[PDB]
Amino acid sequence: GKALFSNPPIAFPN
């Protein structure tokens, strides 16, 4: 559930 709205937007399953 960890989402980083950055470039690139990387999201993690947690």
Short mmCIF file of all heavy atoms in Angstrom, two decimals:
data_model
loop_
_atom_site.label_atom_id
_atom_site.label_comp_id
_atom_site.label_asym_id
_atom_site.label_seq_id
_atom_site.Cartn_x
_atom_site.Cartn_y
_atom_site.Cartn_z
N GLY A 1 0.80 -1.20 0.00
CA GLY A 1 0.00 0.00 0.00
C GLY A 1 0.83 1.25 0.00
O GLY A 1 0.32 2.35 0.21
N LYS A 2 2.11 1.10 -0.23
CA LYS A 2 3.00 2.22 -0.26
C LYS A 2 3.13 2.73 -1.68
O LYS A 2 3.67 2.06 -2.55
CB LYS A 2 4.37 1.80 0.30
CG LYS A 2 5.44 2.89 0.32
CD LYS A 2 5.07 4.03 1.24
CE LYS A 2 6.19 5.05 1.31
NZ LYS A 2 5.88 6.18 2.20
N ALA A 3 2.58 3.88 -1.93
CA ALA A 3 2.65 4.49 -3.24
C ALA A 3 3.40 5.78 -3.21
O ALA A 3 3.14 6.64 -2.35
CB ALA A 3 1.27 4.66 -3.87
N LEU A 4 4.31 5.92 -4.13
CA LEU A 4 5.09 7.11 -4.27
C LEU A 4 4.75 7.78 -5.55
O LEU A 4 5.03 7.27 -6.64
CB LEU A 4 6.59 6.78 -4.23
CG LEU A 4 7.10 6.18 -2.93
CD1 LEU A 4 8.55 5.77 -3.05
CD2 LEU A 4 6.92 7.16 -1.77
N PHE A 5 4.12 8.90 -5.44
CA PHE A 5 3.75 9.66 -6.58
C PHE A 5 4.89 10.58 -6.92
O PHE A 5 4.98 11.73 -6.48
CB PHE A 5 2.43 10.39 -6.37
CG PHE A 5 1.28 9.45 -6.13
CD1 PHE A 5 0.96 9.02 -4.86
CD2 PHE A 5 0.52 8.98 -7.19
CE1 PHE A 5 -0.09 8.14 -4.64
CE2 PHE A 5 -0.52 8.10 -6.99
CZ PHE A 5 -0.83 7.68 -5.71
N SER A 6 5.81 10.01 -7.60
CA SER A 6 7.02 10.62 -7.98
C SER A 6 7.24 10.22 -9.43
O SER A 6 6.30 9.76 -10.08
CB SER A 6 8.15 10.09 -7.05
OG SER A 6 9.40 10.75 -7.29
N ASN A 7 8.41 10.39 -9.94
CA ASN A 7 8.69 9.94 -11.27
C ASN A 7 9.88 9.00 -11.22
O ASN A 7 10.96 9.42 -10.79
CB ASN A 7 8.96 11.11 -12.23
CG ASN A 7 9.08 10.66 -13.68
OD1 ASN A 7 8.08 10.58 -14.41
ND2 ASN A 7 10.28 10.40 -14.14
N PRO A 8 9.70 7.72 -11.56
CA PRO A 8 8.40 7.13 -11.92
C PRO A 8 7.54 6.84 -10.67
O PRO A 8 8.09 6.72 -9.56
CB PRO A 8 8.80 5.80 -12.60
CG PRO A 8 10.29 5.84 -12.73
CD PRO A 8 10.76 6.72 -11.63
N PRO A 9 6.21 6.77 -10.81
CA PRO A 9 5.34 6.45 -9.69
C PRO A 9 5.42 4.96 -9.37
O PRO A 9 4.92 4.12 -10.14
CB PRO A 9 3.93 6.82 -10.18
CG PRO A 9 4.13 7.51 -11.49
CD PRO A 9 5.43 7.00 -12.03
N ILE A 10 6.09 4.63 -8.32
CA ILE A 10 6.26 3.27 -7.94
C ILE A 10 5.33 2.93 -6.79
O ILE A 10 5.17 3.72 -5.84
CB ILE A 10 7.75 2.93 -7.61
CG1 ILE A 10 7.92 1.44 -7.26
CG2 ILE A 10 8.29 3.83 -6.49
CD1 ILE A 10 9.36 1.01 -7.03
N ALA A 11 4.67 1.80 -6.90
CA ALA A 11 3.76 1.38 -5.89
C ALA A 11 4.13 0.01 -5.40
O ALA A 11 4.59 -0.84 -6.17
CB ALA A 11 2.29 1.41 -6.34
N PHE A 12 3.96 -0.18 -4.14
CA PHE A 12 4.31 -1.41 -3.50
C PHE A 12 3.04 -2.09 -3.00
O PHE A 12 2.13 -1.41 -2.51
CB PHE A 12 5.26 -1.15 -2.32
CG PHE A 12 6.54 -0.44 -2.70
CD1 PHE A 12 6.60 0.95 -2.73
CD2 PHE A 12 7.67 -1.15 -3.02
CE1 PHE A 12 7.77 1.60 -3.06
CE2 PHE A 12 8.84 -0.51 -3.36
CZ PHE A 12 8.89 0.87 -3.38
N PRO A 13 2.95 -3.44 -3.11
CA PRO A 13 1.76 -4.23 -2.70
C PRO A 13 1.27 -3.98 -1.27
O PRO A 13 0.11 -4.21 -0.96
CB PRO A 13 2.24 -5.68 -2.84
CG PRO A 13 3.29 -5.62 -3.88
CD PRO A 13 4.00 -4.32 -3.67
N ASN A 14 2.15 -3.47 -0.40
CA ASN A 14 1.75 -3.20 0.99
C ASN A 14 0.94 -1.91 1.10
O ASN A 14 0.46 -1.56 2.19
CB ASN A 14 2.95 -3.15 1.97
CG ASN A 14 3.86 -1.93 1.80
OD1 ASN A 14 4.05 -1.42 0.70
ND2 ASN A 14 4.39 -1.45 2.90
#
